[PDB]
Ligand binder design. Structure first.
Ligand code: CDL
Ligand code: 6PE
Lengths: 446, 105, 34, 425, 55, 34
């Protein structure tokens, strides 16, 4: 037989190599016919100024529209013809372009990625057509109360800083972003030591390095004289934003305190505590018997349609908290029960529930790195945030260190008597006053 | 097992008639005090047993108002008293003790 | 969480042609959990 | 060298009672076990409709070996998961956990599937969840259409909905759940699949606890394709429409031809915000339709039947144009206008798509469980690509011919003032 | 003549009714099954309509 | 009072064959009033 611990040793080591220009090449070999390969760039809206805040998202709309070598839909035909899938996303700190394809097609997939990230032909006719597309997407995003309330949370929490900005940018920016703004963005951020060619699947690390020196050696690894971008720390601000709109049928509320960031060891204990509080949906089967007090109370008393805890990490900062959706006469009870659990874990965390959170996180970690694409993302993103791939055996060590005392100490450090950031949208007349919310962050009995 | 068993059962039948709830047409389980375990068990009763429980209690309260009892023919016989609620209540208690044992670890 | 997959609270709006691709169904499945 | 070890190949066993066991030791940190049962909604009849939906929602109700409280807390204690996935043909009870807790969750899985009590009060409290669960699913317009499409296509069995008819909410009885389990959750109708589990353990479990006899025969009554149309006027912003014909049962060679035809016509997008250049349906509609729209080939294969066609989303006034443009594009294929590079690219999309659908443990487990009930065997990927390669162009043209000439079934929802009937196509 | 002299609007009978044929089935588990089966017969005012009335 | 005529609160039950005659429809009409 084999144990859980022994299975963690059987995970293949993630090989890492760096080209002469600074491009980092990482891979985890498996025994699969398919693979996922892509380029993870350390670029996002936090690097963008107020003028060009919508450029990276605009570039995402143009990355797959043509290049100097494969103009028009020529790239689109090659990917579709070999049955591969091309995808991309942008966040406030990371941009990614990746291809899912047969393992035999890895040489062509790498070639296309290099062609996209270097020789993107941002034709003026295409820039104008993607202008109206993005504006229409902004209208669509307005109808998602979840996406709205989380952008509001960033807007007030990091007010006055780059992280307050949205990824897509404002409506006005999309109607005056020029081709020079986009090329200046690309030539300033798409440098080799900030990119990571990650892959995962059936492939030898040798061939990925060969394709890297073959198709990425032609990349500028020499930064400007003093134009190296450096991320300034982003001031967190205890504040509140309330978009009252009673025409909507359910209220959305997002509350959070300041987290430490990606590389802080305290994230492991914070994620255990969020696992104890967990999440809920009105379609869950557990209901009254759920372990989380917030979840069982919400199910039995119908306090909400859903809630989720989160720990959003950035460079040296983050948003630690929860978000929920409920009827207009339930916002106060959900806030009360939510904060009560934060204070309870700060002061009275028990051992058995902490073993629960550790077990949930172990299952969440292993179940997420299940497939070539999630593993490829964990490779590329980890090399940007941590500068290395953290093996699962290391995560298990950090989780096992956590006991009830660690959760009480770590949670008190970030939750207890701290000013939260609140974001409300919808029928939020019953949303408690900020002072009352702030008073919910400590216990007079403690 | 008649000698010693029937004397104990004989004293129980004595007490049953002395308690006198049978004189109002009630059964033993109709007289139990409603705590949270008992409200759940009553909730779990099937339609017929619930409706029978309601009318017997209603008939007894009507008698208690009038300071009367039923004729002796209509008294609840000790041997015919059905503990219709006990099996539901036993399960409700068993479930609560399981929760409590999980709350200890 | 409850799932409905068929591709092989006001939800949101789909307006442009780019955001419609992938929506056309392509044999329904229903999944429930805890 | 971070080269991985040699992968162990799957093991497979048919017991004489009909049960199928299939295990794969991948030495992964997590284990996955699923009990696949021929108990989908097709096996309901007009007297107990919705019984398999409520059953799908009742996996955490009290069993003979585990209370409802214990099932929820025991699984959550070890961070595990319990899910119930249901199609028109199968119900799939799956459980996930780390390696060292498989014994715990196997015991829960066996209690849920072989010893549920269906306590009258627990069932009563669950009835409103049918309304919540149905309402959440039916806020995708696609769920309405496909459910109506099957009701219009078939006279029985496959006509049945995955979701309980509203008139039955509150009316499904514990007896109906008991009867449904007793004559559908039987050895000849079951398959026990396990990833990260030893084959002797599963074989031991199957022989000890899954030797259930009695019940009903396999597949019940045959699905009688009818043809017809169901139209739902609701004034949605867009019109959703599906037009299909009977195609082929899964496991037949003709079904691969339909699968290849699906990727010739265009199944789904491969490039984010792409124009779908190699999608023959999308370009056909894109010619004379400049408003927003979507179009996709639809392929649904079952034990004794199948449905092939296309699915359209368009403005209400352009609905007829989009549908007629899509139908004509299929006609040209039936007329023999099909190149060999087209079919070879479609095989690449299909072959690539299949392999990508089994790289996760979840998607692998569902495929093995589905094959075990459909085919009674495990067909490895290389043999599947072989069967895909065997599809000739003439086979693809013939499938398109079968669709054009076959009696049609249609479903549509929206403002249907310009959505044609079948006889107007 | 004083109050009902309203002009404008639309022509008489609007668009013509196009008979199609088809079936709608409502599964509801009522105690009894109600069913109606018909064909196109005749416009009112025609002689053929009296024959249907007599039938 | 609101009317629905087509013949040319739990309402009630029809059980026997005598009480069913007259129920089969024989062109719907809808009428409203004060
Ligand atoms: C005079 C006797 C005082 C009686 C109160 C004593 C404290 C008590 O009952 O304990 C509960 C109260 C609960 O405090 P907690 O730990 O924040 O619990 C939060 C609960 O979730 C409850 O949180 P919550 O969100 O439901 O409400 C927080 C609650 C916190 O305040 C209270 O509960 C105190 C109640 C008011 C007491 C009357 C004033 C004297 O806030 C109030 O109700 C304050 C409003 C009072 C306005 C009065 C002016 C008109 O515990 C204490 O205050 C313990 C410390 C006692 C210090 C006394 C010094 C000697
Ligand atoms: C003997 C004293 C008993 C405690 C009474 C008390 O202090 O009331 C609580 C509030 C402050 O707690 P809070 O409002 O921040 O809520 C904190 C909850 N976490 O104080 C006030 O401002 C209320 C004014 C009371 C004056 C009589």
């Amino acid at each position: 037989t084999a144990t859980y611990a022994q299975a963690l040793q059987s995970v293949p080591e993630t090989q890492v190599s760096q080209l002469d220009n600074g491009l980092r090449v990482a891979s985890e070999q498996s025994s699969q016919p398919t693979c996922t390969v892509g380029v993870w760039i350390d670029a996002g809206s936090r690097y963008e100024s107020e003028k060009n805040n919508g450029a990276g998202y605009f570039v995402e709309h143009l990355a797959f529209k043509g290049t100097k070598n494969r103009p028009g839909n020529a790239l689109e035909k090659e990917v579709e013809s070999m049955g591969a899938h091309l995808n991309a996303y942008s966040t406030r700190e990371h941009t990614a372009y990746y291809i899912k394809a047969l393992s035999k097609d890895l040489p062509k997939a790498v070639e296309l990625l290099a062609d996209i990230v270097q020789n993107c032909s941002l034709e003026d006719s295409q820039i104008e057509k993607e202008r109206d597309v993005i504006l229409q997407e902004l209208q669509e995003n307005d109808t998602s109360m979840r996406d709205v309330v989380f952008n509001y949370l960033h807007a007030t929490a990091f007010q006055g800083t780059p992280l307050a900005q949205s990824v897509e940018g404002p409506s006005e920016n999309v109607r005056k972003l020029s081709r020079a703004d986009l090329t200046e963005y690309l030539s300033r951020h798409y440098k080799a030591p900030r990119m990571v060619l990650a892959a995962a699947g059936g492939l030898e690390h040798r061939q990925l390095l060969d394709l890297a020196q073959k198709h990425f050696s032609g990349l500028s690894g020499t930064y400007d004289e003093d134009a190296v971008p450096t991320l300034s720390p982003c001031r967190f601000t205890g504040s509140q934003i309330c978009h009252r709109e009673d025409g909507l049928p359910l209220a959305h509320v997002a509350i959070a305190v300041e987290g430490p960031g990606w590389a802080h060891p305290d994230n492991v204990a914070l994620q255990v505590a969020n696992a104890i509080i967990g999440h809920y949906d009105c379609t869950y089967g557990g209901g009254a018997h759920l372990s989380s007090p917030l979840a069982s109370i919400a199910a039995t008393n119908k306090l909400c349609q859903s809630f989720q805890t989160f720990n959003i990490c950035y460079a040296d900062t983050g948003l630690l908290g929860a978000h929920f959706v409920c009827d207009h006469m339930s916002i106060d009870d959900m806030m009360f029960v939510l904060q009560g659990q934060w204070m309870r874990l700060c002061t009275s965390a028990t051992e058995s529930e902490v073993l629960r959170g550790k077990n949930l996180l172990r299952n969440a970690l292993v179940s997420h790195l299940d497939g070539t694409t999630p593993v490829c993302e964990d490779i590329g993103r980890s090399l940007l945030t941590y500068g290395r791939r953290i093996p699962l055996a290391e995560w298990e060590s950090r989780i096992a260190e956590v006991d009830a005392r660690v959760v009480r100490e770590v949670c008190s450090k970030y939750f207890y008597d701290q000013c939260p950031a609140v974001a409300g949208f919808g029928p939020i007349e019953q949303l408690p006053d900020y002072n009352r919310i702030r008073s919910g962050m400590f216990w007079l009995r403690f | 097992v008649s000698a010693s068993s029937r004397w104990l059962e004989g004293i129980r039948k004595w007490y049953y008639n002395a308690a006198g709830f049978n004189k109002l047409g009630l059964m033993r389980d109709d007289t139990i005090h409603e705590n949270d375990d008992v409200k759940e068990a009553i909730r779990r009763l099937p339609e017929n047993l619930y409706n029978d429980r309601v009318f017997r209690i209603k008939r007894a309260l009507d008698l208690s108002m009038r300071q009367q009892i039923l004729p002796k023919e209509q008294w609840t016989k000790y041997e015919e008293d059905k503990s219709y609620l006990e099996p539901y209540l036993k399960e409700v208690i068993r479930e609560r003790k399981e929760r409590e044992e999980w709350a200890k670890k | 969480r409850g799932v409905a997959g068929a591709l092989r609270d006001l939800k949101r709006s789909v307006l442009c042609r780019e955001s419609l691709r992938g929506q056309a169904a392509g044999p329904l499945v229903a999944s429930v959990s805890l | 060298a971070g080269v991985p070890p040699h992968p162990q190949d799957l093991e497979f066993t048919r017991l004489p009672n009909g049960l199928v066991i299939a295990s794969l030791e991948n030495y992964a940190p997590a284990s996955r076990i699923g009990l696949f049962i021929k108990a989908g909604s097709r096996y309901e009849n007009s007297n107990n409709l919705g019984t398999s939906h409520l059953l799908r929602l009742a996996s955490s109700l009290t069993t003979k070996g585990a209370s409802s409280f214990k099932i929820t807390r025991g699984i959550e204690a070890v961070g595990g998961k319990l899910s119930v996935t249901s199609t028109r043909e199968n119900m799939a009870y799956t459980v996930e956990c780390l390696r060292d807790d498989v014994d715990i969750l196997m015991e829960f899985l066996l209690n849920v599937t072989t010893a549920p009590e269906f306590r009258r009060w627990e069932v009563a409290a669950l009835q409103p969840q049918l309304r919540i669960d149905k309402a959440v699913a039916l806020q995708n317009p696609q769920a309405h259409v496909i459910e109506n499409l099957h009701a219009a296509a078939y006279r029985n069995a496959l006509a049945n909905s995955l979701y309980c008819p509203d008139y039955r909410i509150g009316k499904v009885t514990p007896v109906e759940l008991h009867d449904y389990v007793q004559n559908h959750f039987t050895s000849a109708r079951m398959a026990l699949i396990g990833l990260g589990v030893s084959h002797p353990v599963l074989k031991q479990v199957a022989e000890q606890f899954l030797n259930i006899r009695g019940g009903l025969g396999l597949s019940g009554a045959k699905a009688k394709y009818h043809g017809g149309e169901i139209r739902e006027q609701n004034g949605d912003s867009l019109v959703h429409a599906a037009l299909v014909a009977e195609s082929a049962a899964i496991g037949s060679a003709e079904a691969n031809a339909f699968s290849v035809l699906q990727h010739v016509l265009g199944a789904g997008p491969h490039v984010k915000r792409g124009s779908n250049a190699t999608s023959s349906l999308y370009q056909a509609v894109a010619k004379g339709v400049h408003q927003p729209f979507d179009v996709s080939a639809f392929n649904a294969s079952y034990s004794d039947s199948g449905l092939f066609g296309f699915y359209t989303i368009s403005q209400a006034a352009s609905a007829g144009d989009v549908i007629k443009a899509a139908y004509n594009q299929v006609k040209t294929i039936a007329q023999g206008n099909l190149s060999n590079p087209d079919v070879q690219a479609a095989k690449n999309k299909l072959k690539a798509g299949y392999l990508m659908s089994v790289e996760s443990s979840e998607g692998f487990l569902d495929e093995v469980g589905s094959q075990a009930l459909a085919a009674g065997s495990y067909t490895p990927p290389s043999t599947v690509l072989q069967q895909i390669d065997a599809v000739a162009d003439a086979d693809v043209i013939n499938a398109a011919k079968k669709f054009v000439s076959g009696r049609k079934s249609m479903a549509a929802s929206g403002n249907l003032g310009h959505t044609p009937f079948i006889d107007e196509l």
